[PDB]
């Protein structure tokens, strides 16, 4: 119903966005201490998903386009607790590059994090345009963690995602950790390297249903790993489980499927002129010798 047309920031081209990529990537390298030396990679990915995950396919409300996370209603969404750190991270980036829209910056931060953490290339398109504060979606559009596969499946229909896209997207839970103070879930062992480990862990660990100090159930393993009830639902549902096994046994296929679904997620709600530039594929720092 609402239409949002991609409008390229004036006169900008690939090299401009590569420059923004690189500033994000260098800071990512710089600020290595954050969250017990996990770095900001994971929270930037989470931020990019939460700013896109407000989308509603039925009326094209929410979505990354409007960059509405900058307004207090959305930034104070309880579902977004902890994400202020990612916002604070990108603040000097925005100040150095004031011409990039908020939506483009938030989504590009997510792409950059994934690639720098050795995940797949994620094609990325520019052209999100900031929209006014009253276009900010209401709280409560992001998913709950204490639910089952049916919830997860239904939830993601609203973002136009199918079983394979959901299971692939969840693979980002290889990254970073939960924070009791943020979500009511107790962090387990944490990584900042993007791999298909989330699926391996699901299938190979000895999971026990435990209560954490916030009185929420989560699945914990002797090895110090953890899963959310919605994570675990991927192996409880037989359709989800088949895909989990696939990604666990095929790193390349996971990367390819993640790349597509993550780009899709970041682009939901946006109309790209026939006219628009092709998606950009940014080189990593290591590819550039930086
Ligand atoms: C049913 C879906 C999902 C639910 C219930 C869920 C729930 C959560 C929870 C509770 C947190 C911890 C927040 C805090 O304690 O710091 C979180 C962390 C995170 N989520 Fe999800 N999530 C879902 C899907 C996704 C998807 C689609 C992505 C991205 C493609 C993703 C990326 C992340 C990342 C990277 C973290 C780690 C953040 C950090 O370490 O600071 N999540 N998830
Ligand atoms: C968020 C972050 C890390 C995770 N590891 C397993 N499930 C997770 C959710």
Curated annotation (Swiss-Prot):
Binds 1 heme b (iron(II)-protoporphyrin IX) group per subunit. Its main location: mitochondrion. It comes from Saccharomyces cerevisiae (strain ATCC 204508 / S288c) (Baker's yeast). The modification Phosphotyrosine is found at residue 151. GO terms for molecular function: cytochrome-c peroxidase activity; heme binding; metal ion binding; peroxidase activity. The active site is at residue 50. CCP1 precursor is processed by the rhomboid protease PCP1, which cleaves the N-terminal hydrophobic transit peptide. The m-AAA protease (composed of YTA12/RCA1 and YTA10/AFG3) is required for CCP1 maturation: m-AAA protease promotes membrane dislocation of the CCP1 transmembrane segment within the transit peptide to ensure the correct positioning of CCP1 within the membrane bilayer, allowing intramembrane cleavage by PCP1. One of its GO terms (biological process) is hydrogen peroxide catabolic process. Belongs to the peroxidase family. Cytochrome c peroxidase subfamily. Present with 6730 molecules/cell in log phase SD medium. One of its GO terms (cellular component) is mitochondrion. Forms a one-to-one complex with cytochrome c. Destroys radicals which are normally produced within the cells and which are toxic to biological systems. Its EC number is 1.11.1.5. Its cofactor is heme b. This is Cytochrome c peroxidase, mitochondrial. It catalyses: 2 Fe(II)-[cytochrome c] + H2O2 + 2 H(+) = 2 Fe(III)-[cytochrome c] + 2 H2O. It is found in: Mitochondrion matrix; Mitochondrion intermembrane space. Keywords: Heme, Hydrogen peroxide, Iron, Metal-binding, Mitochondrion, Organic radical, Oxidoreductase, Peroxidase, Phosphoprotein, Transit peptide. The record marks 46 as: Transition state stabilizer. Heme b binds at residue 173. It is an enzyme of class 1 (oxidoreductase). The chain holds residues 71 to 361 of 361 of the full protein.
